[PDB]
């Protein structure tokens, strides 16, 4: 039993409007440099589709995530330590630049410098950001399939259509689409960390954020294959890998991530989750992949249990973190209401970014149909998005938790309508799904009203603990180049000292 904390994220797909604002803000701040211009830490994909990189969910092709051996032990699908090492001179599964898209720019200056007497209006043609050469045509992009852009038979190759008779969905009347915004999961059992030969990737203890140490990374580029979500991008210029950093510079002071605060649909929730690090391997190696979801929930700890609180303190969790964990929207959606589900729990990484499945218009039927258990509002069985699809995406194929989430959402709706339109108290739908009137009211407070202070309950990472904030406050930022940052030993070849440190020791003790 070792309690650790992390700020998790829950995205309500039901409210996602597929706008991409989240993707742009991240890009502007973190990946506008040459080398990662093609990298989208946060990217939104329209489903059905194959995503970015193309078909990243196909683990038989890409080899991402963990596999549970016959003896019960965990191993990266990539291969064990020696197998992985044997592939280092040339990663055989590595995605190529074309699997993402060839980053491009346009010759705008031609619109400006076109010489007088041209025989046709000047125009700006595309140029490769990798070669600098003229591109005859743009044939791909990071969001190429946006809004069902492409033939159904092409989009339907979607790994999530497995085990589903998909013919019926190529019919205009049965058309359906949803949005899947995604970033790094900052998993509890990250495959990237396990697949990096130099050990440059790590999970920060105080807040669970997983980073690639830009000093230590050696560019072995094996981690990219290891991540089953393909959220690690190789910086072709620097020769090192980079990935979503969960905006730690902001999280550290209690601020939401950029993609969270900038989410126009108000669908992202940030809240603390306390977990037993000692139960990670045990949960990730459960026999049936359909149990990984529940096994992870079991690894989460109840922030209001004085047994948990007392242990948290003993294990070093700051008081303000424990308090935040007690008002965590993420805990309420994942543990209480059971509305949030993990993304592809079968990869066995124990993802920390969960999702609330979306509702959808009712399927096409012979007639305008009739009232169901929820009146004019839809019954979970009439939803047009095939539940088996959502289950392949969030619950290893098990439709039970997906239906429970969707049904409860509809339940809240039925209840709220009785109240606001009829003026009566009708708990029939709630009782049907096991929700109390209070839980439904609290679900409504968080999902519908969703005040800013309710969506984001981020505690400080407490950068003052176990460190020396005073000298840091005084000297951080003066980047003259003292050459002493980055190491604990004071000796240095350039015979210099840290600008943000005190080298004149007190002699008064």
């Amino acid at each position: 039993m070792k309690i650790r904390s992390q700020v998790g994220m829950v995205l309500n797909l039901d409210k996602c409007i597929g706008c991409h604002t989240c993707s742009v803000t991240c890009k502007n701040v973190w990946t506008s440099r040459e080398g990662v211009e093609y990298a989208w830490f946060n990217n939104v994909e329209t489903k059905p589709g194959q995503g970015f990189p193309t078909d990243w969910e196909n683990q038989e092709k890409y080899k991402g995530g963990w596999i549970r051996k016959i003896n019960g032990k965990l191993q990266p699908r990539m291969g064990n330590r020696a197998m992985l090492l044997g592939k280092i001179f040339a990663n055989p599964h590595l995605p190529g630049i074309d699997d993402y898209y060839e980053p491009f720019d346009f010759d705008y200056q031609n619109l400006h410098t076109a010489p007088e007497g041209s025989k046709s209006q000047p125009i700006a043609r595309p140029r490769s950001l990798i070669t600098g050469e003229r591109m005859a045509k743009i044939e791909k992009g990071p969001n190429w399939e946006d809004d069902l852009g492409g033939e159904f038979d092409k989009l339907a190759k979607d790994k999530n259509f497995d085990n589903i008779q998909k013919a019926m969905y190529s019919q205009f009347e049965n058309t359906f689409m949803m949005y899947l915004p995604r970033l790094c999961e900052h998993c509890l059992n990250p495959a990237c960390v396990a697949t990096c030969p130099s050990g440059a990737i790590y999970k920060r203890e105080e807040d669970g954020i997983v980073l690639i140490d830009q000093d230590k990374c050696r560019g072995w580029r094996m981690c990219i294959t290891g991540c089953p979500y393909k959220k690690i991008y190789f910086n072709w210029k620097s020769g090192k890998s980079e990935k979503c950093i969960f905006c730690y510079p902001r999280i550290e002071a209690g601020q939401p991530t950029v993609c969270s605060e900038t989410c126009v649909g108000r669908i992202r929730y940030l809240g603390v989750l306390l977990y037993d690090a000692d139960a990670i391997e045990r949960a990730a190696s459960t026999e049936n992949e359909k149990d990984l979801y529940q096994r992870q929930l079991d690894v989460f700890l109840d922030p209001n249990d004085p047994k948990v609180i007392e242990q948290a303190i003993k294990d070093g969790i700051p008081l303000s973190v424990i308090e935040a964990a007690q008002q965590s929207p993420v805990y309420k959606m994942a543990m209480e209401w059971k509305l949030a589900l993990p993304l592809h729990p079968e990869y066995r990484t124990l993802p920390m970014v969960w999702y609330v499945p979306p509702l959808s218009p009712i399927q096409s039927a012979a007639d305008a149909g009739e009232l169901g258990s929820n009146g004019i509002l839809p019954d979970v069985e009439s939803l047009r998005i095939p539940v088996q699809y959502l289950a392949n995406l969030l619950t290893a194929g098990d439709t039970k938790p997906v239906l429970r989430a969707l049904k409860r959402m509809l339940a809240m709706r039925h209840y709220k309508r009785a109240e606001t339109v009829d003026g009566k108290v009708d708990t029939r739908a709630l009782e049907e799904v096991g929700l109390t009137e209070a839980q439904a009211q609290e679900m409504y407070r968080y999902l519908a009203i969703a005040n800013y202070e309710d969506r984001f309950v981020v505690p400080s990472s407490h950068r003052e603990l176990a460190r020396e904030a005073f000298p840091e406050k005084n000297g951080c930022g003066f980047t003259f180049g003292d050459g002493c940052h980055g190491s604990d030993t004071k000796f240095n070849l350039f015979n210099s000292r840290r600008i943000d440190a005190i080298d004149v020791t007190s002699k008064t003790e």
Binding site: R81, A90, G219
Partner: protein, 220 residues
């Protein structure tokens, strides 16, 4: 000629050896962000599988042969080591050269690789291909002295160089010229090592084979 012989085989070896070591240390302490393998695989996967493997498995064979070859009686008289070096090392060398040549054809003519490469990457790779070609070329010259007479000379030199014993150059009295070129170009590579992509070699991830899978860094 005696002047050049002393410069190149008595002095130069220590200049390149000092630059190699201090240059590596200094770039490690002040250039971590620049310390990478500089993979280009993603920009063009074509042929990289065969090429890189050939080149690396090959050059690593040579390196093992050269190591235990010149830096290390009854069960291993010099003549037997020569034969091993000629067949085992010659085979590795052919694999290395082919890979090296393919990697170079790629770096120079693969538009994406060429556009994003640095001068050093072309230089260093070129010098290795040439060094590997020279290497294989010494084979027919060692084939004239199957008794290990030449090898005994080269090994005498190498050993007196690494134990800081003066006069190392003497050990080379009359060796085939070809060997002289190989020794000089090979040492040069050590001189250019700390300023090239070759620093990745220092980072061969051996600790991985015995490391726990999940890493967590405490507050620091």
């Amino acid at each position: 000629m005696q002047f050049l012989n002393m410069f190149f085989f008595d002095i130069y070896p220590y200049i390149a050896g000092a630059v190699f070591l201090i240059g590596s240390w200094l770039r490690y302490d002040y250039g971590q962000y620049t310390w990478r393998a500089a993979s280009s695989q993603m920009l063009d996967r074509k042929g990289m599988n065969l090429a890189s493997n050939l080149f690396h498995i090959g050059i690593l064979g040579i390196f093992v042969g050269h190591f235990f070859g010149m830096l290390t009686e009854a069960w291993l008289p010099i003549e037997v080591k020569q034969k091993m070096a000629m067949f085992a090392g010659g085979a590795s060398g052919v694999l290395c050269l082919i890979g090296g040549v393919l990697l170079l054809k790629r770096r120079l003519f693969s538009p994406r690789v060429r556009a994003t490469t640095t001068g050093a990457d072309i230089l260093i790779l070129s010098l290795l291909v040439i060094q590997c070609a020279l290497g294989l070329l010494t084979i027919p010259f060692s084939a004239q002295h199957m008794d290990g007479s030449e090898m005994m000379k080269l090994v005498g030199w190498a050993q007196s160089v690494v134990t800081f014993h003066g006069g190392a150059s003497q050990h080379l009295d009359g060796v085939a010229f070809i060997f002289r070129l190989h020794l000089v170009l090979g040492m040069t590579l050590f001189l250019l090592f700390p300023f090239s992509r070759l620093i990745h070699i220092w980072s061969v991830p051996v600790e991985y084979l015995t490391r726990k899978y999940q890493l967590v860094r405490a507050r620091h």
